[PDB]
Coordinates of C-alpha atoms in Angstrom, one line a residue:
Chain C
X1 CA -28.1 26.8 -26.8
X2 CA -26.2 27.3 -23.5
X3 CA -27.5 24.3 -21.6
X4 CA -26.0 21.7 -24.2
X5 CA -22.9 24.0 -25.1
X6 CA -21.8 23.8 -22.0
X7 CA -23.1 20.3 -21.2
X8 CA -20.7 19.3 -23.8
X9 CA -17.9 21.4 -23.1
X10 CA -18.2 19.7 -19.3
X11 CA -17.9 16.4 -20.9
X12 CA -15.0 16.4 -23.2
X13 CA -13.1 18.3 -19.9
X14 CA -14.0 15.6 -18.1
X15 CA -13.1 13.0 -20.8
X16 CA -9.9 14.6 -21.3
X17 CA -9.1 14.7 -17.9
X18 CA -10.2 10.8 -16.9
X19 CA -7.9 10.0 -19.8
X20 CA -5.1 11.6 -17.9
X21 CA -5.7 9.6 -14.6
X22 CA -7.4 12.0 -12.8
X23 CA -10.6 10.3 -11.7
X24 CA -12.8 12.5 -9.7
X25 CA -12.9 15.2 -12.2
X26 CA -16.3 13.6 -13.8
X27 CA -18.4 15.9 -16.1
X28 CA -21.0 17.0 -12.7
X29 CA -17.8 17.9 -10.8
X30 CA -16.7 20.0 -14.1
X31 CA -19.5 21.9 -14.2
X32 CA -19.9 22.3 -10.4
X33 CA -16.2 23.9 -10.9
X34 CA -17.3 26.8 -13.1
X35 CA -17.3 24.6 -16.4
X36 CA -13.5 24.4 -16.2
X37 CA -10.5 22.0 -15.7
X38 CA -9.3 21.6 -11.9
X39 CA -6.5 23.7 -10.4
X40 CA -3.2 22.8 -9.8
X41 CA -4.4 22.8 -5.7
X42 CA -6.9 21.1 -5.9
X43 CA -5.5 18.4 -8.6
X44 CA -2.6 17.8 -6.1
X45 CA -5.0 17.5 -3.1
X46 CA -6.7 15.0 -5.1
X47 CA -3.0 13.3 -5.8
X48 CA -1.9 13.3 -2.3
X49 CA -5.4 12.6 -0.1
X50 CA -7.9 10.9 -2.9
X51 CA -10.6 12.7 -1.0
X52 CA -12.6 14.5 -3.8
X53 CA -11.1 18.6 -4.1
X54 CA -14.4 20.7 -3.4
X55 CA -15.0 22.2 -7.0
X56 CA -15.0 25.9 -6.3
X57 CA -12.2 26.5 -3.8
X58 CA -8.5 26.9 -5.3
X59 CA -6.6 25.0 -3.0
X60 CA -3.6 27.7 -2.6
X61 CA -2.0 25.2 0.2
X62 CA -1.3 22.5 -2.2
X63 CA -0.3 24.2 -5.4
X64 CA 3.5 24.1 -4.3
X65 CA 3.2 20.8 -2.7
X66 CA 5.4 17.4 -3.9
X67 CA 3.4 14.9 -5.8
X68 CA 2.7 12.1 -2.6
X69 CA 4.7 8.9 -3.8
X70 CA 1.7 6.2 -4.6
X71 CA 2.3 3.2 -5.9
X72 CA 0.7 0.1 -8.2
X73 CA 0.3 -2.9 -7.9
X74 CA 1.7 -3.8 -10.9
X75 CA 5.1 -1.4 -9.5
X76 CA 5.1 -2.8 -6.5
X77 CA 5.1 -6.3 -8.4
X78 CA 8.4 -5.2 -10.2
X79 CA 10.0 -3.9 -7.3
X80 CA 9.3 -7.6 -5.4
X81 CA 10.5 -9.3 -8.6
X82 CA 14.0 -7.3 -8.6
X83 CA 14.6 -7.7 -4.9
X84 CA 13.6 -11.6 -5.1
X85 CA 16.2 -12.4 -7.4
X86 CA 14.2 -15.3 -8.9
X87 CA 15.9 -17.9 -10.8
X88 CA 14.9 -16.9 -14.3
X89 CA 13.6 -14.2 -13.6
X90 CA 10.4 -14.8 -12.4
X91 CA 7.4 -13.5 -10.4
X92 CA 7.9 -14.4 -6.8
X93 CA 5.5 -15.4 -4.3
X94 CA 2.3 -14.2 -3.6
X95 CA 3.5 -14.4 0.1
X96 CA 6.8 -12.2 -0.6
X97 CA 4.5 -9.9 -3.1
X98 CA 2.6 -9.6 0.1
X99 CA 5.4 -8.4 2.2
X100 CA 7.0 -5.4 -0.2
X101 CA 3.4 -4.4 -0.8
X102 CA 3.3 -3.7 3.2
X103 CA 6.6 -2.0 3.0
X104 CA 5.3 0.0 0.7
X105 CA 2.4 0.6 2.8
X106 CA 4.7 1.7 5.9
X107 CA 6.5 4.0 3.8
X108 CA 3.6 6.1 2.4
X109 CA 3.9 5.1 -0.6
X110 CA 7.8 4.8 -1.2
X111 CA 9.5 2.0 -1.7
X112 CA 11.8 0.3 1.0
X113 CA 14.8 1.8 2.8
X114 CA 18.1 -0.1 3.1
X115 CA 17.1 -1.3 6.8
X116 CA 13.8 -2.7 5.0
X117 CA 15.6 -4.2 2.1
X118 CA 17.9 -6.4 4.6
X119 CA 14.8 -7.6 5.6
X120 CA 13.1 -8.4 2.7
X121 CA 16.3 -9.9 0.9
X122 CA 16.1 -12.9 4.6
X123 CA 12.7 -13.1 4.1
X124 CA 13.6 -14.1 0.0
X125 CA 16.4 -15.9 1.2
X126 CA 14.0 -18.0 3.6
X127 CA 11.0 -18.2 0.9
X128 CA 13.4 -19.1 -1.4
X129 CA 14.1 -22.7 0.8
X130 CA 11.5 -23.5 2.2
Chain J
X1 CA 27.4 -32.2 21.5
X2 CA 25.0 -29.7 23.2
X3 CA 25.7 -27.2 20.3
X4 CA 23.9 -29.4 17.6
X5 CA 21.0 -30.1 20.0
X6 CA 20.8 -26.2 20.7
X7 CA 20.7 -25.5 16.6
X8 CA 18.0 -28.1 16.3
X9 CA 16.1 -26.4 19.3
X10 CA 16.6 -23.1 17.5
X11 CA 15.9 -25.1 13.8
X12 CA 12.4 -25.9 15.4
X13 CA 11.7 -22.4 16.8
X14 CA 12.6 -21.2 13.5
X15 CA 10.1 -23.0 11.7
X16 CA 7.4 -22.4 14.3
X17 CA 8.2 -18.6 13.8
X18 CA 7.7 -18.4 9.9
X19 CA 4.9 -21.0 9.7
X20 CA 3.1 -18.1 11.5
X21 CA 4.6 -15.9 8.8
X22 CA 7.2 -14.2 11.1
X23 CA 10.0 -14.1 8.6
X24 CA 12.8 -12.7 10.2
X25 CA 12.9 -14.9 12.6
X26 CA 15.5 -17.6 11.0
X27 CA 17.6 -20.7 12.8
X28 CA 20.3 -18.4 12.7
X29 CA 18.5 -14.9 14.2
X30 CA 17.2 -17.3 16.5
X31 CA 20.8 -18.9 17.7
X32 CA 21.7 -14.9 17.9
X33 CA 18.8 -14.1 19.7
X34 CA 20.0 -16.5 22.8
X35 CA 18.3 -19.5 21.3
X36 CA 15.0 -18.4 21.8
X37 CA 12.2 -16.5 19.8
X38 CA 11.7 -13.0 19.4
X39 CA 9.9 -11.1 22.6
X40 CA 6.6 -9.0 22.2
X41 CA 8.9 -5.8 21.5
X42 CA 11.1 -7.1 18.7
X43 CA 7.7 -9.1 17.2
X44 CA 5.9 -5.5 17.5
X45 CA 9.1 -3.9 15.9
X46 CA 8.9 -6.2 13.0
X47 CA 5.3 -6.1 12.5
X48 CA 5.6 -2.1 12.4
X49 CA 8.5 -1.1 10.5
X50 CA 9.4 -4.4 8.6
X51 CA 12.9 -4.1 9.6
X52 CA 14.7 -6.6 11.0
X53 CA 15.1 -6.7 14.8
X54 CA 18.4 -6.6 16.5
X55 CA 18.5 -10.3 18.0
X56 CA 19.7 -9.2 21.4
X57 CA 17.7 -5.5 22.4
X58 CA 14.2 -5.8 23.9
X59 CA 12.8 -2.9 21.9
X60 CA 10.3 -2.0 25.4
X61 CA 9.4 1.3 23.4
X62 CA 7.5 -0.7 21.0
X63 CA 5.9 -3.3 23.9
X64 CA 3.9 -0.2 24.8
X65 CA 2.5 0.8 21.1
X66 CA 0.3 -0.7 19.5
X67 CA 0.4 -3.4 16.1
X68 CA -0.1 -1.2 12.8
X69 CA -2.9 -2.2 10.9
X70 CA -1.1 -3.4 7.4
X71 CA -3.3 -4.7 4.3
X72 CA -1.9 -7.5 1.8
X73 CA -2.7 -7.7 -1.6
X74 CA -5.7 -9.9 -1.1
X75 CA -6.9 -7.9 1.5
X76 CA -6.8 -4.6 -1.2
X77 CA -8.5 -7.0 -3.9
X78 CA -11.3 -7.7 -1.3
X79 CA -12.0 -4.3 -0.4
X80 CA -11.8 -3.1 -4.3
X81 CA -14.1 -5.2 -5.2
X82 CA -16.5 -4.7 -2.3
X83 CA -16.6 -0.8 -3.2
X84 CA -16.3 -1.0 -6.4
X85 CA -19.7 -3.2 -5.7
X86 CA -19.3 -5.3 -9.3
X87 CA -22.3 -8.0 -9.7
X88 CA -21.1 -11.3 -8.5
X89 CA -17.8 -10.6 -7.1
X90 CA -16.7 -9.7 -10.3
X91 CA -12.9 -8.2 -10.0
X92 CA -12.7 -4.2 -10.8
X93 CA -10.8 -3.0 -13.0
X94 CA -6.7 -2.7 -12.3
X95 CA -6.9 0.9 -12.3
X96 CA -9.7 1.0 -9.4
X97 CA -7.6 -1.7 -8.1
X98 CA -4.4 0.3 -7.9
X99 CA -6.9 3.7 -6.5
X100 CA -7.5 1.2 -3.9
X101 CA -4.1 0.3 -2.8
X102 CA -2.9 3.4 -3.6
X103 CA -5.7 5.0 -0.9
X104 CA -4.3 2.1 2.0
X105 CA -0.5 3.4 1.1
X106 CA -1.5 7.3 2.0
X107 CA -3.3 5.4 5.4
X108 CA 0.2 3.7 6.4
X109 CA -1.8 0.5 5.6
X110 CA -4.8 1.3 6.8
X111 CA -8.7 1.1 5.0
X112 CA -10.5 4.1 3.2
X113 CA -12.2 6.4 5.6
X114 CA -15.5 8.0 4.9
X115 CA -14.0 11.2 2.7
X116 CA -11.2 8.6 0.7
X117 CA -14.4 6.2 0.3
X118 CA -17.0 8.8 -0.7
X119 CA -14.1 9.6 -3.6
X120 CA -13.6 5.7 -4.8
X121 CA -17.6 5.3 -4.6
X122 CA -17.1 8.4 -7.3
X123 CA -14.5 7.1 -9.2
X124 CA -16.3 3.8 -9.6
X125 CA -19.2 5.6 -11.1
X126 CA -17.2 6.8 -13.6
X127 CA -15.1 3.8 -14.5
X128 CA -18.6 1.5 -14.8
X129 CA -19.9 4.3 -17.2
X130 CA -17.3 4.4 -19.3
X131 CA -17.3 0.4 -19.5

């Protein structure tokens, strides 16, 4: 029985690779790629645009490209807790969470330069007193 | 003294400035800025790069660009859970959450366009039929 073989085979690729983080291979988009995993092109246009890969081309542009820095939440939320400095180390404002979220967001995804970090340590430094 | 009226002047510009959430702008930047808050350029530079303006420069190559469109966290909560279309504003799940905020960091801050929404619709198919 072809039909269910490979309707099965689709869906533990597909579970295997939602496991791994990789979102838009679902078991249709599996099958739509030949009944087989995505390519290294087309898994790191996925990591770098989040625009679903088209399922049958290979994607030879991205296969040698660098992994585009994304980040959490909860990473960003770490980063905002080291650079506050809270007493007791504590999560720090919503408002200055806010703030090295949009750094983040300037930088493409990467975290803040030393120029940006002057600013967010005033910006603690302010939120801090008030 | 003159000197202590001129802080206070600059004290009260200085909490004017962050009340609106302009953070750089503190008593002292404001004192180095010649006692007075920041011009369009240097609010422009701030509001683009997030670095902190130098209190005396005009920064005219940024009167003439325009504000980047930034998102806060809220702002990436909303839209998750708009796309993500939950029943009754039910938060997503982190991970769509994160795909979210994740999709505004490629846009320099900006929202999902109709390819990087088409993708999120997708990916929050699969994450409501696996839950």
């Amino acid at each position: 029985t072809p039909e269910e073989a490979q309707r099965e085979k689709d869906t533990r690729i597909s579970k295997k690779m939602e496991t791994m983080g990789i979102y838009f291979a679902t078991p249709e988009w599996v099958a739509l790629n030949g009944h087989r995993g995505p390519s290294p092109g087309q898994l790191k246009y996925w990591q770098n645009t989040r625009e679903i890969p088209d399922p049958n081309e290979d994607y030879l542009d991205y296969v040698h490209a660098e992994k585009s820095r994304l980040a959490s939440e909860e990473q960003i939320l770490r980063a905002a807790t080291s650079i506050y400095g809270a007493p007791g180390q504590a999560e720090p404002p919503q408002a200055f969470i806010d703030e090295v979220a949009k750094v983040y967001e300037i930088n493409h995804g990467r975290g803040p330069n030393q120029e940006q970090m002057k600013d967010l340590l005033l910006t603690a430094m302010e939120m801090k007193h008030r």
